[PDB]
Design a protein around this ligand. Structure first.
Ligand code: SF4
Length: 298
């Protein structure tokens, strides 16, 4: 029985399990903390665990390691990867800095640790506007998501240059205006909670624009919601709010990287102490400074 063995090994390893909101229900049920990556990493800094098992994708485990350098961070599969974060290369950043002289470089926290090391500051979707409004530049380099960049440009009035120019999340790009229309026909009493990684024309139809943490916070505002994000979030919301209704905007909105994590490989991760996530000291130092600036600016 995986669950029993996982729980026993978690105690033996002095480990905590951090699960992203898109993890399967059976994985979330054995997690200590559930949320988005930055809040998970920060919550781990307040406990004296020796090991973090990160049920999530590579860049999220990296953020955990950046904020918890004295803990062993394990990712159950190195195939738990983020296509959007992987679109951005260091060369994209250096080239953009050359093309937009002196413009600040802002990195969405959904990004690799290496990319954060070239950032002046990081942002979450929830603090991106507040942070960017404090940059005294009409032009801002922003990556890796062009769709969040559009939202930031709209809310700040600044010229936001996405890096890379076509960076985006393939999961959230699946949502279309037809999915909006289908939702309104089938669920006329529902409101639409839409992730800022969705395309601009879909964002425009939202009742709320929110990351997963904001979806949980603002779900209290209505009794029925159609959810424009990765489909496992619906189960997360249903378990949090059993008396509300939540429906996926698309049944096929599936992050392959997130589903690389299984009960079986969480068991194997704890049993064998793999796969170790490391962040080079200099990259970690610079990524840490960009995260610290984000707190100072919000
Ligand atoms: S849902 Fe998109 S942005 Fe999130 S981990 Fe998957 S590919 Fe990356």
């Amino acid at each position: 029985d995986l669950v029993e063995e996982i729980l026993r090994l978690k105690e033996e390893r002095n480990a905590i399990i951090l699960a992203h909101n898109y993890q399967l229900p059976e994985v979330q049920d054995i997690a200590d903390f559930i949320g988005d990556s930055l809040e998970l990493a920060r919550r781990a800094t307040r406990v004296d665990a020796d090991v973090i098992v990160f049920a999530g994708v590579d860049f999220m485990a990296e953020t955990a390691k950046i904020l918890n350098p004295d803990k062993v961070v394990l990712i159950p599969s190195r195939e738990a990867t983020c296509a959007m974060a992987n679109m951005l290369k260091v060369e994209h950043i250096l080239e953009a800095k050359r093309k937009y002289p002196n413009a600040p470089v802002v990195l969405y926290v959904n990004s690799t640790a290496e990319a954060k090391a070239y950032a002046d500051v990081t942002v979450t979707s929830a603090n991106a506007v507040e942070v960017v409004k404090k940059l005294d530049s009409d032009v801002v380099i922003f990556g890796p998501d062009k769709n969040l960049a559009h939202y930031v440009a709209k809310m700040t009035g600044k010229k936001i240059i996405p890096v890379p120019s076509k960076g985006h999340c393939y999961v959230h790009q699946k949502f279309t205006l037809d999915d909006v229309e289908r939702a309104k026909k089938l669920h006329p009493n529902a409101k639409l909670m839409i992730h800022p990684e969705c395309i601009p024309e879909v964002q425009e139809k939202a009742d709320i624009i929110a990351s997963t943490g904001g979806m949980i916070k603002r779900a209290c505002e209505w009794d029925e919601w159609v959810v424009f994000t990765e489909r496992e979030m619906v189960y997360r919301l249903r378990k949090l709010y059993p008396q509300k209704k939540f429906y996926p905007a698309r049944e096929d909105a599936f992050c392959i990287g997130m589903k690389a994590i299984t009960l079986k490989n969480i068991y194997e991760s704890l049993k064998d102490m793999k796969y170790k996530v490391e962040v080079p000291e200099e990259i970690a130092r610079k990524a840490r400074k960009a995260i610290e600036r984000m707190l100072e600016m919000s």
